[PDB]
Design a binder for this molecule. Structure first.
Ligand SMILES: Nc1nc2c(ncn2[C@@H]2O[C@@H]3COP(=O)(O)O[C@H]4[C@@H](O)[C@H](n5cnc6c(=O)[nH]c(N)nc65)O[C@@H]4COP(=O)(O)O[C@H]3[C@H]2O)c(=O)[nH]1
Ligand SMILES: Nc1nc2c(ncn2[C@@H]2O[C@@H]3COP(=O)(O)O[C@H]4[C@@H](O)[C@H](n5cnc6c(=O)[nH]c(N)nc65)O[C@@H]4COP(=O)(O)O[C@H]3[C@H]2O)c(=O)[nH]1
Length: 226
């Protein structure tokens, strides 16, 4: 795929830095190709070698090995990483199976989020009616100045809503004009992504304050871990 060209790393040391960081942090890697996917890990990296853990499933390992053009994505703090390799070949690392490949000559280091996102806790409830007058309810997952993630029905990306209630318990209750911008999966549990519409400056300051206090509270409690 493609992202803003500012996100594309091409300097070999640039590409390598990002990869060494995935390794040192043990970030899970998601391999996908035409017809399958599997979770792996960066086991070791040199300028000439990428070594990836085998998958858990013998069938996925057989199917990666005959694939071409394999996309690898990883989710780190503050970024999404993504690159492609032409093929994986079997090897051994520390006496156990592994995939080896030449590193990609380029990689995406994707950082599109303008606003900080804080995770919701003890769960917070939300609810809205649908065009057929039933009531959709879901659990808030995370929160930013411009939107919210929710965990759970037949809906469609692009759906716009108007009066969506957010009971954040001890803090208080609010609503927003939000648009369902992404339906995905999270563990087989479905996940919604909302961007807020028509957020007045008054509400912006409210959202700022709540996000602040939740962050500060996590800080205070974790200090208390002492
Ligand atoms: N349209 C839209 N959809 C959103 C937005 N936020 C979350 N989603 C949807 O929710 C899925 C999961 O987001 P996540 O848990 O933060 O999990 C994300 C997050 O860890 C990371 N990621 C992707 N892009 C970025 C980024 O630009 N910045 C950061 N820091 N992480 C990113 O990769 C994971 C998977 O990303 P996806 O495959 O795209 O899958 C995303 C996407 O379908 C958004 O602002 N707009
Ligand atoms: N807490 C929370 N807030 C959400 C969620 N989804 C959307 N928002 C809010 O909605 C704003 C605009 O979303 P957008 O139009 O998809 O525009 C997004 C989208 O195009 C893209 N993007 C950011 N993160 C992701 C991601 O994880 N996956 C994908 N596919 N796209 C992303 O970058 C643009 C800017 O991202 P932001 O500055 O963060 O701005 C986001 C964020 O403030 C969510 O799941 N959780």
């Amino acid at each position: 795929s493609h992202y803003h060209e500012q996100f594309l790393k091409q300097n070999p040391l640039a590409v390598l830095g990002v990869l060494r960081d995935l390794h040192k942090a043990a970030i899970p890697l998601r391999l996908s190709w035409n017809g399958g996917q599997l979770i792996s890990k960066l086991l070791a990296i040199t300028p000439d070698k990428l070594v990836l853990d085998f998958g858990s499933q013998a069938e996925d390992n057989i199917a990666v090995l005959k694939a071409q053009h394999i996309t690898i994505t990883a989710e780190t703090q503050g970024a999404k990483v993504e690159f492609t390799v032409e093929q994986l070949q079997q090897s051994e690392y520390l006496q156990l199976p592994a995939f080896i490949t030449v590193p990609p000559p380029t990689l995406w280091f994707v950082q599109r989020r303008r606003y900080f996102r804080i995770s919701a806790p003890p769960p917070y409830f939300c609810q809205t009616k649908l065009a057929d007058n039933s009531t959709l309810r879901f659990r808030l997952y995370d929160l930013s100045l411009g939107g919210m993630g929710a965990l759970l029905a037949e809906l469609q990306e692009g759906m716009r809503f108007a009066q969506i209630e957010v009971n954040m318990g001890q803090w208080g209750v609010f609503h927003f004009d939000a648009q369902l911008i992404s339906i995905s999966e999270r563990i087989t549990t479905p996940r919604l992504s909302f961007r807020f519409l028509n957020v007045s400056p008054t509400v912006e300051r409210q959202l700022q304050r709540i996000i602040f206090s939740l962050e500060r509270e996590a800080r205070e409690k974790a200090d208390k871990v002492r």
